[PDB]
Amino acid sequence: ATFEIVNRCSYTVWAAASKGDAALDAGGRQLNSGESWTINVEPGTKGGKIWARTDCYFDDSGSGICKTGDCGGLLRCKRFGRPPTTLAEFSLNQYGKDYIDISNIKGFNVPMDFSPTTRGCRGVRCAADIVGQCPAKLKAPGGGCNDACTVFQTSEYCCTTGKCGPTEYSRFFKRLCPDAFSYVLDKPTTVTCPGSSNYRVTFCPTA
């Protein structure tokens, strides 16, 4: 399948795409403002993620640091990213359908549209100034708005036991982005698409 990753923001991002234990395609790439990067993801992938990283440095070989979303210091992510990271999430060709979501469960850093480029299903977006509003205790020095599980490590915020409810903080993300997951047991805002759809991830969409 095809993912076209478009930086519509006015600042450079370093896009990332991983499943957790391996890169997807090249695993990451600088995107200056306006730059598009199309990747290939295998049918049937489960639990894929696409995110932005901000304020990175990488040297000639590719090792470095980013202030949000860092994946073990690699330009080319083979693992997931340090919060706060807004997340595009997907598992493809499940049993005849792909399923797409955007998640604020690791926080928010960059506004995002995740829309299908082929018919049948609707996209999802979170574009609100979450970082401009972000509750004071959830702010990340380095940039972004952390989730409460990251800042406080409690069973309730982290839904450790498989039981939890919404919180003042989950609800701060759900007031600003009802279509994105705001905590682990949120009512799902997942989208079911035909198997083998293609997609566009747009950062800063409304930019």
Query: DSSP string of 21-59?
Result: SSEEEEEEEEE-TT-EEEEE--TT--SEEEE--EEEEE-
Domain, as residue range, for 22: 1-207
- For the chain, the residue count is 207
From residue 101, alpha-carbon distances to 43, 80, 174 in Å are 17, 16, 14
d(CA 35, CA 71): 21
165, 156 in Cβ contact below 8 A? yes
| Token code pair at residue 157 | 């915020």
Q: CA 91: distance to chain centroid?
A: 14
Count CB-CB contacts under 10 A for residue 59.
Answer: 8
Query: DSSP string of 146-184?
Result: --HHHHH--HHHHTTTS-----HHHHHHHTT-TTSB-ST
User: Tokens 């470095």 correspond to what residue?
Assistant: 64
Beta bridge partners of 57: 65
As a whole number of Å, the end-to-end CA separation of the chain is 27
Domain count, the chain: 1
25, 48 in Cβ contact below 8 A? no
From residue 128, alpha-carbon distances to 111, 180, 186 in Å are 7, 11, 19
| Radius of gyration (C-alpha) of the chain in whole angstroms | 16
Record the resolution, in angstroms: 1.2
Q: How was this structure determined?
A: X-ray
d(CA 182, CA 180): 6
